[PDB]
Amino acid sequence: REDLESYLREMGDVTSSNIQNWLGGRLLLVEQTAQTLARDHSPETVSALLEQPALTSTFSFTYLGQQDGVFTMRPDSPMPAGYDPRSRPWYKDAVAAGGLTLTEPYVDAATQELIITAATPVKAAGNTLGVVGGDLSLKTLVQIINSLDSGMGYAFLVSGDGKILVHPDKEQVMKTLSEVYPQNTPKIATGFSEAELHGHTRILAFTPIKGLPSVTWYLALSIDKDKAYA
Amino acid sequence: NDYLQRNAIREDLESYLREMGDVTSSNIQNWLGGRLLLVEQTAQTLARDHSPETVSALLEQPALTSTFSFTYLGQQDGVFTMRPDSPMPAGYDPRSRPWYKDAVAAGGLTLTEPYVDAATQELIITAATPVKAAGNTLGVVGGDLSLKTLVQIINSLDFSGMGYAFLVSGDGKILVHPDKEQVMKTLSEVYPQNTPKIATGFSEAELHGHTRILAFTPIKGLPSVTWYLALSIDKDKAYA
Ligand SMILES: CC1=C(O)C(=O)CO1
Ligand SMILES: CC1=C(O)C(=O)CO1
DSSP states (O other), rough: OOOOHHHHHHHHHHHHHHHHHHHHHHHHHHHHHHHHHHHHOOOHHHHHHHHHHHHHHTTEEEEEEEESSSSEEEEEOOOOTOOOGGGGGHHHHHHHHHHHHOOOOOOOTOOOSSEEEEEEESSSOOOOOEEEEEEEHHHHHHHHHTOOOOOOOEEEEEEEEEEEEEEESTTTTTGGGGGGSSSSSOSSSSSSSEEEEEEEEEEEEEEEOOOOHHHHHEEEEEEEEEHHHO | HHHHHHHHHHHHHHHHHHHHHHHHHHHHHHHOOOHHHHHHHHHHHHHHOOOOOHHHHHHHHHHHTTTOOEEEEEETTTEEESSSSSOTTTTOOGSSSSHHHHHHHTTOOOOOOOOOOOOTEEEEEEEEEEEETTTTTEEEEEEEEEEEHHHHTTTSSSSGTTEEEEEEETTTTTTEOOSSGGGTHHHHHHHHSSSSTTEEEEEEEETTTTTEEEEEEEEEEEOOOEEEEEEEEEEHHHHH
């Protein structure tokens, strides 16, 4: 029960850093693209830039939404009618942050599936020219986090407000903690916690993900206490 | 009996080590992958426009200057542009440097082993890629990484106070290590008696009067290099 919380804590520690450093590369690419677009944002620059393989092979899609609503994405995608990037959560989030941010998951305007977007504003001479965004798949992140097994439980992502952001259990996504654990609702603080999910007793531990811009997200470990102690 | 007990502890410990090495190995892979993709975007951008304005403005962009000590373009005709700015040594030719030759020998993005900086005479690692426009190679982009930086990434976690991590080539050249004296020495020079072998996975060896357990994990997705993550565990403390 002690040597346990010595390894639990240390999993979350490097696991959190793994997801931290996976993300960090993608954020740099989004920021570098925006900084380029600040100096040159002509249409052929924009398309050339977003066609570049470093982008395409890193996010589902990479795009520029401009302050006049003009939209350019890569790769090509059939587009829904009445689309306006300025209305979208990556756009609003980025303008609010005045810099790099990560959306909580929202319903993609094209696929109607959930995604997360890393975005930032394109800004030149105290003018917002638009926002750059890069789309990342939830399942692609469930994998990065649930990369390890010892076989007792799984990992997932939660906000400092209890909103479940990523998960191996597809139903859990975007539900609060109080709606998965209504009795003995686990505090998202330091330490460990006990709760019953589906009828089994499970330990729950939280680790801060360092270095995520403009958000406060936690790695969550969920163990079966029975299997763990045995 | 002592044989079956000590085999259960060794096997338990080896399991823990193998999964510490897997995730630490992923962490440095991702960290390195991120710097290699930033050098590739910088080169693909330059391929489309390499005028002196554009080059200067691009290399000054904060995403580059806060990730690398220096970012630079060396061109086939030997012209060199670096930001941040630096006093430069006489005779400098970018095309003679390890980063420039490696990249062109690689055909794409690669990583150098530690080499001596032409400017600071100190050991650095460089992420680099050729600038390719219409089949041609206009030059090479390089991004500089400090060794203390990589030592920190791979030593994030303490392995229960059991030991530490370093990086080593497939040929046994210690590339990055918490003890400066070890950098660029060989496993043969540091463990002259029972030199750990990289293919074996778990080796037992002796350093500074204590028995260490050495474990090696491939790092995936580093173009043109074969580096391993190495853990060194104090055997006695680990077993205890
Ligand atoms: C189509 C794509 C989605 O991620 C949005 O809703 C904005 O860019
Ligand atoms: C400035 C730059 C360094 O990384 C070298 O030592 C060669 O080019």
